Amino acid sequence: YSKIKISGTIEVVTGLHIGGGGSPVVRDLQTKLPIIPGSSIKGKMRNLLAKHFGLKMKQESHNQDDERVLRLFGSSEKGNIQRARLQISDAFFSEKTKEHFAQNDIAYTETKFENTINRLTAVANPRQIERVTRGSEFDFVFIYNVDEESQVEDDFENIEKAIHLLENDYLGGGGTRGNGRIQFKDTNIETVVGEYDSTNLKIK
Amino acid sequence: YSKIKISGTIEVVTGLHIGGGGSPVVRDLQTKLPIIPGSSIKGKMRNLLAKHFGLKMKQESHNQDDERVLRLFGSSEKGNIQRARLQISDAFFSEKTKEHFAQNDIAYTETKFENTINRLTAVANPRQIERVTRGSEFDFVFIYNVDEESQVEDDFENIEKAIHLLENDYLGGGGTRGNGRIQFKDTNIETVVGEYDSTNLKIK
Amino acid sequence: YSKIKISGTIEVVTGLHIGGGGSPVVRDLQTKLPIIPGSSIKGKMRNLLAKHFGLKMKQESHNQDDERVLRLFGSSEKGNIQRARLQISDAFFSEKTKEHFAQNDIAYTETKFENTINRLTAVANPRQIERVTRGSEFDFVFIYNVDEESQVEDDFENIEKAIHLLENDYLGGGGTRGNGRIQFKDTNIETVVGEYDSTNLKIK
Amino acid sequence: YSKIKISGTIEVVTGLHIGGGGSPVVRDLQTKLPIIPGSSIKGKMRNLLAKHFGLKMKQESHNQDDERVLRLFGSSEKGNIQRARLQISDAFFSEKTKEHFAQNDIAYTERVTRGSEFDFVFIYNVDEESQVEDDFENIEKAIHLLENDYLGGGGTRGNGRIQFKDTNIETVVGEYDSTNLKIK
Amino acid sequence: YSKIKISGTIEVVTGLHIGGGGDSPVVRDLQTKLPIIPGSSIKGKMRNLLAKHFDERVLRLFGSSEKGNIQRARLQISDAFFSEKTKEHFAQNDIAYTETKFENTINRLTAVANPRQIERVTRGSEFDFVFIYNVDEESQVEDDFENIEKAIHLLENDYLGGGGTRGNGRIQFKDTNIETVVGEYDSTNLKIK
Amino acid sequence: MNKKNILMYGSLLHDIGKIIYRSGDHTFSRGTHSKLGHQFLSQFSEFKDNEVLDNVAYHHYKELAKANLDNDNTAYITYIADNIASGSGNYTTLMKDMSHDLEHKLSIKEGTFPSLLQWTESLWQYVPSSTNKNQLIDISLYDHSRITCAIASCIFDYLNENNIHNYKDELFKSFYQKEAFLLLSMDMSGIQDFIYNISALKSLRSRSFYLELMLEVIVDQLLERLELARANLLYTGGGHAYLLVSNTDKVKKKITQFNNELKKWFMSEFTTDLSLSMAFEKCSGDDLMNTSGNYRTIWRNVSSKLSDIKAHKYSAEDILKLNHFHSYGDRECKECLRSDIDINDDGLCSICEGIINISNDLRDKSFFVLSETGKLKMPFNKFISVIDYEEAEMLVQNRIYSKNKPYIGIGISTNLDNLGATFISGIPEKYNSISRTATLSRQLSLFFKYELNHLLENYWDDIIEASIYINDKFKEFT
Amino acid sequence: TKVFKLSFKTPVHFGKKRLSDGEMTITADTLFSALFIETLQLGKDTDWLLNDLIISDTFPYENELYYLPKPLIDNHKAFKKLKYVPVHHYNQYLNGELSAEDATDLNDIFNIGYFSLQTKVSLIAQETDSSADSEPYSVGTFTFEPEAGLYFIAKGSEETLDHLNNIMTALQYSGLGGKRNAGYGQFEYEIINNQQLSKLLNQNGKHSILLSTAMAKKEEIESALKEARYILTKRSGFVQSTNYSEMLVKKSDFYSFSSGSVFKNIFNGDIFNVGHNGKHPVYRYAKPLWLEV
RNA sequence: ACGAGAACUAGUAAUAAUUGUCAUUUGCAUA
RNA sequence: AAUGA
């Protein structure tokens, strides 16, 4: 029984709006800074990697997916329980970035003003959207459980596919209108518990 | 499943005034330079390509519009499920322009003084408008989702129609007085995710 | 739905003082050469072609105009939405004029010294004003949208009359004392978007 | 709104020296040949016409003139708008004079050499149908006074008196009859 | 015969959700309305982890006592409570004790979304805890403490409560003190991290 | 026909001419109520008992004053019991129906008295008992008639058991003061503990039913052992049974014997979780009547001796036999948690399994039958079994317990905060009699057992709403 | 004749028949059990305290106040809702000097904690294997206010009570209830001698009030119940480590008097054997601790 | 030798899909 | 800069 740890940095490319309040952005209430919830990341990876493999109409109805997808994220509802293997924790604002922003006096949040033009009348109506600044960083951690020895290489291949797909997609809302693009950098793999070596493993 | 990448440069022909913060312009605050938001590009292209096809008064009432328009830009509102197939990203002030403008001592912003003459009174009122400078450039990236293997050619034909129409129109605000005229250069098509071909595809 | 292009050259015969930087002359910051803002042309043409038709004092108080002017130019202020159908861009020095002034070693600006002699005291007060060298040529473009297959002919007759009145007038400032007289030349019509027949139209 | 036009030529007899340079003469730097600022003719006709009618010392202090000058010439600085109805344009040579001088090999500057001709083109807007006759008879009077006075700087020693010839009163925009007018 | 007490504090790294009432309603006291971690929660999670690692060890330390053989529990785990330092600091900085998180679910084939709420103990809080060990066999205390150390390690790299696959529950252990409270057995050398 | 039956029959219906006079039937509404009733009943062939006619014709003063009856005839004892108890077309429709029922349905032979009792109850439970202008009549005619019967039977037990034959001279105030009859009380403990011994929410009505049925069975048995009827039972329910008997040596000995048998059986069936206590205090004809407010005193004394008997409910032999070893280690009842009884395969003992089965049957079937062998245990080696309607009439052709169904004529059948002030005081002055507690108990029972079901027919927030509604209704009640 | 004060700080589970039950106090038999188990655990001698120690029931206390069980000596509606009487009024209670309004105020002031049904689950089932239903169960707990708790009375010589001191010092780290190994029921204690407690314990009268649960020996029962007012309560339960199967081992039923009993004639008690088909005896405590008023 | 003792309120799901800070406005009037 | 949705 072994547990493998993955840590790294999320970098914001264009403005990001997780916006879980409802238009505010989600904040920790001990520090008053933005955070990236982990259920967002898990849900987006579920959707993307599921659509990669065959997604059927009958498989559309029941929220069941391919066997591989269920194996990596868990089903545990179908009368055939499936325990998950990949635990996704939240990510928080980094100390390097808060130092930099306080030094150069850069506010942490933008308020973009937007407009809509309706048809037949051309009377516009405006609105306000808050969004994280670009150049921000967050620190992310993943844990993966070795419930079986012979599936590790395949599972990490699939996680690499999910990373690629997410890095060519968006997190949060307003993704088609511009918001929410990310990259991952400075990763690291380590066997934090157990006796399973993880030197040949990599997530780009 | 496949995602295809479009990329290129926007060339500013006359003054551009998005004014997203509004008489200032819309700026980043990690670098304090102008940008072109993706929202405005999407909206203007959509309005052109909808007007070019049919526009009915009842269809004018509620933003109900042609089928191809909703297939390529997304509605999923009227109980029919349709998420957008084209992802449009923001445009960031390019590096070559930065180098040239720095080493010739040319600013990034014109300040134009405007006048209004009243009727039957002949009193002038002055105004100041802050326009992005001529000769600039920006960089843009689009992502295309392939949700159906037998519509790629048609959707790309509609896209090149929208691009051509916009090369004969204005982006921004106050374009009926000489603002916002743009051009597109150096367009490249790549398939980022999948095993799909993009050698016969083109956009002018 | 289609879009016609009107192009040509504006030739200045007398002094041209526009002073948009104001007593210098408005100038591009990337080439360091004068321009005519499109705002000036649109405003001057609107005032001329609007004074010709009925110009009521009650309409002047409420800034209401004649229906022809609003359909050709658009106001959308009285609760009735009217989008402009004629788009006017700026002007710039033509290549031939640049080559001619470069070969002949002739500058682009004249400094005129003007003397004011005042009543009852006779004290001569001098002034310096900058003007654009007479005999230079500017390149202009208008874009015409078709929204109704019929009214194109009437619209082009009206734009003919507007060009005529402008050609018997001055552009810019300092007109009632010798500056601003220009004319149009080398007008061309070429349908650039759509499938419309506009080869019998004639702009002189 | 009809645009009527006046055009004519001006003959030079006394070696002229305007003083547009502020000892040279003002030149358009496209042809290096003498010109005449339109402010010159505008202001000089203005001053003569103002002198002819009553001129008050209090109005001299405040740069106020008669209603005729405020209409024809127009100032629009007292809080009452008066846009000018007589666009004066800058005058150039005539090609006749240039051809004659080139054939006879005569220079232009001594001062403005004698025997020149100048093409002056005025544009008159008809903002009111009725007052047309009064305005044009006033312009005729002003032209006569100018013909019997001097234009230029420092002309009080024999320079700056010139003649009017060869007019043509043509309507260029409008549908108004302009055959009964005259400006000699 | 000796009794040993292991005392310390546990810190909440990401939001915690035990939620016995639900699932938003987090377990509290019904009078002081302060969140607590029941000892059954810790006992069960540690049992599951340590069993997955490997038996007679789990049976001697947590006790079975009905499988045809009767073994009595050798480790007693108590409830945990909010600490005074954290109450003072939060009262000064004006922070609430509990957060509310808003979430959403998406229908396949229908793309319609519907909401949820999850109540969750705040980040940075602290709890105080004590465990008791009854020394019934002298030649086994080192083995029992090796096993308890492994259990605390595993629980440190895992989650407590509900919804931990989506990002809740992570905890840390600080400020350990190991004192022999009844008897004359030498426990000034033990360590638990 | 035993003379006891003669008195009892002339006793229940001795006051029916009052209805035939209120009905306005011109045929039999001209004279005094006694002769009106006699004339009415002189029709039907079954009711042609001569001494019953004599009993019903003269239940007042002048009637006996001018009738010069014999020395042994129940009209005198009728008079005495009546006195001690005492302390518009719908009536015409009712007497039409009465004529039809009397000539068609009922039987007059021995053992038909309970059927006659249910008949009178089902018909008369709302007739105004009297319309006296100087009195407040909070009683129905049913209560006057029934308590008159109970008093009559008790007076007869007393007079006959002491070997007196000259009833007239003995009973025609001096007798009213003698310690003639007794008040008797049964209280069963442990109801709350036994009712909440279930492991879900609707299952706690079956064992409520079991407790209620046992109380009714034991009280009906007691009345049978003493040669009276269910007339002599004032109140039942909760855990209580208030009853009235005679003050003679024979009944005292029989009460003692019955007490011993009940104590033995309750200990046998259940160890100590359910008991039964019986206490009796003697009363005179004056005590139940309102003379010097002594009724409160009587009630308090009965409660006092009841508390004392509760304090010392066992003896040394019992407590030593209880602490005697017995076999254990076998499983206990999964719902009832008691390991002294043999258990079946399903995991429930005899009584708890019987209760669950009888609740399952009660949800569909609705008649209970008291037999020698059957399903659920009862005192004295008797059992209760479940049967349906037509089955009930066939069994009647060859005792039956129901649920609030007033079926009449089918053999013998028995249809099944400030409380202390109401139960002990009632009306302190001018109305302090046994009849008033009778009617108060009847009205409270109608509210508790029948009106509560009607209220709940349409049924956390609900609990509060019901509490507020109950409080408001009780405020309106008093 | 010292008294022991105990404060808990954590909820406790005592219970009557099931785990769903929550109870405030426990009985002298439960504490004799605790002390006996702890002595056998510490390796000492049970002989000294088998037949020299007299223990009483547990009783509640509040800030500076003490309560005692209601003795079984006009409103007859308010007293029946009372379980404990304060010490200062104890004598006044037995002389009929307590009024209804005072009793009602007492009922008002007597809140010393609250109750809670904690719900839990079990996944040790085939949930480990595959799809299998979870099993929600419920435990009942009682919680004290910061200044309430329990007190006990113990008497005898000085040596026995020094032994008792040692036993309580050792015991204060185990628990006194049900789900002890789940995190319930620990305490800290103090040894007290109050003046008024000694005054009540040293009265002189004709009757006697029982502060424990006890049973008369055979040869005296016939003379014990001459004039008495008592309550019999069946006491059953399961054993801790008699034989192989726990289920096959369950104590034989026992009946004993309650803690408000009044006896005109005193009896000594006995420690009773309630074992059968076991390896070692299982004792129930039954020895009375009197107060004579 | 305490109505005892073994017993994680767990498990699957996120913040969504659509939307142009745009429409009207001559640095202009006098020696 | 002026008034709006």
Residues 6+ apart with CB under 8 A from F174: none
Q: Between β-strands C124-132 and C109-117, what pairing exists: parallel, antiparallel or unpaired?
A: antiparallel
CA E164/CA E162 separation, integer angstroms: 6
d(CA G248, C1' H1) / Å = 16
Cβ pair B107, C29 in contact under 8 A: yes
- Long-range CB contacts (< 8 A, 24+ apart) of C31-36? C33/C92, C33/C93, C33/C108, C34/C93, C34/C108, C34/C109, C34/C132, C35/C90, C35/C91, C35/C92, C36/C10, C36/C90, C36/C91, C36/C138, C36/C171, C36/C172
d(CA F350, C1' I2) / Å = 96
Nucleotides on strand H with an atom closer than 7 A to protein CB? 1-31
- Long-range CB contacts (< 8 A, 24+ apart) of F380-389? F380/F221, F380/F261, F380/F265, F382/F217, F384/F213, F384/F217, F384/F358, F386/F358, F386/F361, F386/F362
Q: Between β-strands G290-291 and G209-210, what pairing exists: parallel, antiparallel or unpaired?
A: antiparallel
Cβ pair F369, F400 in contact under 8 A: yes
Task: Using alpha carbons, list the distances in angstroms from residue F59 to D66, F12, F87, G225.
Answer: 141, 12, 15, 54
CA F224/CA F215 separation, integer angstroms: 14
- Residue A53's Cβ-count burial label (10 Å; 0-12, 13-18, 19+) is middle
Instruction: Give the H or E element holding residue B145.
Output: strand B137-146
Nucleic strand H contacts from chain B, 170-199, CB < 7 Å:
170-177, 180
CA C185/CA C203 separation, integer angstroms: 10
Q: Is the CB of A116 under 7 A from strand I?
A: no
Please indicate if any CB of chain A lies within 8 Å of the CB of G181.
no
Tokens of D102: 């080139």
Q: Between β-strands E2-12 and E171-182, what pairing exists: parallel, antiparallel or unpaired?
A: antiparallel
Q: Do E123 and A88 touch (CB under 8 A)?
A: no
- Distance (Å) from the alpha carbon of F323 to chain G's nearest alpha carbon: 6
Experiment used for this model: cryo-EM
Q: Helix axis angle, F249-269 relative to F141-161, nearest 10°? A: 110
Query: Which residues on chain E are in Cβ contact (under 8 Å) with B83?
Result: 111
Q: Where does C13-160 show beta strands of DSSP type E?
A: 86-93, 109-117, 124-132, 137-146
d(CA E130, C1' H1) / Å = 28
- Say which amino acid occupies G105: D
Do chains E and G meet with 3 or more Cβ pairs nearer than 8 Å?
yes
- Say which amino acid occupies D94: S
Q: Do F322 and G255 touch (CB under 8 A)?
A: yes
Q: Is the CB of A22 under 7 A from strand I?
A: no
Instruction: Give the H or E element holding residue C184.
Output: strand C182-193
Residues written for chain A: 204
Which chain B residue's Cα is nearest to E107?
B81
The per-residue DSSP string of F95-151 comes to HHHHHHHHHHT---STT-HHHHHHHHHHHHTTSBS---TTS----BHHHHHHHHHHH
Tokens of G275: 């074992």
Task: Count helices and strands (H / E) in chain G.
Answer: 7, 17
Cβ pair E110, E84 in contact under 8 A: no
Residues 6+ apart with CB under 8 A from F218: F186, F262, F276, F379
Which chain G residue's Cα is nearest to A79?
G131
Of F313, F319, F331, the CB nearest to G255: F319
- The 8-class DSSP code of residue F331 comes to P
| DSSP bridge partners of A188 | A7
* Phi/psi of residue D80, nearest 5 degrees: -115, 120
Cβ pair E9, E129 in contact under 8 A: yes
Cβ pair F15, F128 in contact under 8 A: no
Residues 6+ apart with CB under 8 A from F51: F3, F6, F10, F73, F74
Closest CA to A89 of F425, B189, E166, B54: E166
Do chains E and C meet with 3 or more Cβ pairs nearer than 8 Å?
no
Please indicate if any CB of chain B lies within 8 Å of the CB of A148.
no
Q: Is the CB of B124 under 7 A from strand H?
A: yes
Nucleotide H16: closest residue by CA–C1': E113
Q: Where does C46-108 show beta strands of DSSP type E?
A: 86-93
Q: Between β-strands F400-401 and F413-414, what pairing exists: parallel, antiparallel or unpaired?
A: parallel
- The 8-class DSSP code of residue G52 comes to S
Give the C window 65-124 contacts with A, CB below 8 Å.
Answer: 76, 81, 83
d(CA G193, C1' H24) / Å = 97
Q: Is the CB of E23 under 7 A from strand H?
A: yes
- Distance (Å) from the alpha carbon of D81 to chain B's nearest alpha carbon: 7
Task: Using alpha carbons, list the distances in angstroms from residue G126 to E41, E51, F380, G122.
Answer: 19, 15, 50, 10
Q: Helix axis angle, E141-156 relative to E39-53, nearest 10°? A: 100
Tokens of G129: 């294997």
Q: Tell the residue number behind the tokens 């007033």, with chain if given.
A: F406
* Phi/psi of residue F405, nearest 5 degrees: -120, 110
Q: Do E1 and G241 touch (CB under 8 A)?
A: no
d(CA B172, C1' H21) / Å = 10
Cβ pair A180, A171 in contact under 8 A: yes
Q: Greatest CA span in chain E, whole angstroms?
A: 70
Q: Where does E18-148 show beta strands of DSSP type E?
A: 75-77, 81-82, 98-106, 113-121, 126-135
Q: Helix axis angle, B38-52 relative to B152-167, nearest 10°? A: 100
Q: Is F445 helix (H, G, I), strand (E, B) or coil?
A: helix
Domain range for E111: 1-193
Q: Is C63 assigned a ligand-binding role in the annotation? A: no
Positive or negative: CA dihedral D148, D152, D156, D161: negative
Q: Is the CB of E116 under 7 A from strand H?
A: yes
Nucleotide nearest to A121 (CA to C1'): I5
3-state helix, strand, coil in chain B (%, to 5): 25, 30, 40
Nucleotides on strand I with an atom closer than 7 A to protein CB? 1, 4-5
Tokens of F353: 């399994």
d(CA G176, C1' H2) / Å = 7
Outline where B35-178 has alpha helix (H).
Answer: 38-52, 57-61, 67-73, 95-104, 152-167
- Say which amino acid occupies A177: R
- Residue E124's Cβ-count burial label (10 Å; 0-12, 13-18, 19+) is middle
Residues D42, D47, D52: CA angle, nearest 5 degrees: 130
Q: Where does F360-403 show beta strands of DSSP type E?
A: 367-371, 376-378, 382-387, 400-401
CA F254/CA A100 separation, integer angstroms: 103
Resolution in A: 3.5
CA G260/CA G208 separation, integer angstroms: 10
Cβ pair F432, F426 in contact under 8 A: yes
CA D71/CA D55 separation, integer angstroms: 16
Nucleic strand H contacts from chain C, 83-102, CB < 7 Å:
83-84
What subunits touch chain B, counting only 3 or more CB pairs under 8 A? A, C, D, E
Q: Which residues of E are annotated as a binding site for Ca(2+)?
A: 157, 178
Closest CA to A13 of A176, A170, A165, A129: A170
CA E30/CA E44 separation, integer angstroms: 24
Tokens of C104: 């002949």
| DSSP bridge partners of E20 | none
Q: Where does F365-424 show beta strands of DSSP type E?
A: 367-371, 376-378, 382-387, 400-401, 413-414
Q: Is the CB of A118 under 7 A from strand I?
A: no
Instruction: Give the H or E element holding residue F161.
Output: helix F141-161
Which chain G residue's Cα is nearest to E131?
G183
Report the domain count for chain D. Answer: 1
Query: Which residues on chain E are in Cβ contact (under 8 Å) with G143?
Result: 29-31
Tokens of E56: 């007679």
d(CA B55, C1' H20) / Å = 18
Query: Which residues on chain E are in Cβ contact (under 8 Å) with G245?
Result: 68
CA D87/CA D122 separation, integer angstroms: 6
Task: Using alpha carbons, list the distances in angstroms from residue F210 to C10, F235, F335, F336, F361.
Answer: 113, 18, 16, 14, 14
The per-residue DSSP string of chain A comes to -EEEEEEEEEEEEE-B---TT-----B-TTT--BEE-HHHHHHHHHHHHHHHS---HHHHHS----HHHHHHH----SSS-----EEEEEEEE-HHHHHHHHHHT--SEEEEEEEEE-TTT--EEEEEEEEEPTT-EEEEEEEEEES-STTHHHHHHHHHHHHHHHHTS-SSS-TTTT--EEEEEEEEEEEEESS---SS----
d(CA F194, C1' H11) / Å = 39
- The 8-class DSSP code of residue F457 comes to T
CA G112/CA G146 separation, integer angstroms: 9
Nucleic strand I contacts from chain B, 50-69, CB < 7 Å:
none
CA G183/CA G11 separation, integer angstroms: 9
Cβ pair A155, A161 in contact under 8 A: no
Q: Tell the residue number behind the tokens 């109409």, with chain if given.
A: A57
Task: Count helices and strands (H / E) in chain C.
Answer: 5, 6
- Distance (Å) from the alpha carbon of E138 to chain G's nearest alpha carbon: 14
Secondary structure in 3-state letters for F175-218 = HHHCCCEEEEEEECCCHHHHHCCCCCCCCCCHHHHHHHHHHHHH
Cβ pair D13, D161 in contact under 8 A: yes
Query: Which residues on chain A are in Cβ contact (under 8 Å) with E159?
Result: 87
Which domains does chain G show, CATH number per domain? 1-63+143-202 (3.30.70), 68-111 (no CATH), 204-293 (no CATH)
Give the Cβ contact number of residue F29 at 10 Å.
17
Tokens of F232: 């002599």
Q: Is C166 helix (H, G, I), strand (E, B) or coil?
A: helix
Closest CA to F49 of F110, F94, F95: F110
Cβ pair F396, F411 in contact under 8 A: yes
* Chosen from G128, G130, G133, G134 to mutate, greatest number of chain A CBs within 10 A: G130
CA A183/CA F113 separation, integer angstroms: 98
CA G173/CA G175 separation, integer angstroms: 7
Closest CA to C156 of C193, C112, C189, C133: C189
Closest CA to D15 of D23, D7, D5, D4: D23
- Residue F313's Cβ-count burial label (10 Å; 0-12, 13-18, 19+) is middle
CA D37/CA D91 separation, integer angstroms: 7
CA E192/CA E145 separation, integer angstroms: 8
Q: Do D29 and C106 touch (CB under 8 A)?
A: yes
The per-residue DSSP string of G107-156 comes to HHH----EEEEEEE---SSTTTTSS-----EEEEEEE--TT-EEEEEEES
Cβ pair G177, G140 in contact under 8 A: no
Residues F57, F61, F66: CA angle, nearest 5 degrees: 70
Q: Is the CB of B125 under 7 A from strand I?
A: yes
- Long-range CB contacts (< 8 A, 24+ apart) of F407-410? F407/F118, F408/F105, F408/F115, F408/F118, F408/F119, F408/F122, F409/F105, F409/F106, F409/F115, F409/F119, F410/F115
Q: Tell the residue number behind the tokens 């106040």, with chain if given.
A: G65
CA G84/CA G25 separation, integer angstroms: 12
Cβ pair G24, G110 in contact under 8 A: no
Which chain F residue's Cα is nearest to G249?
F329
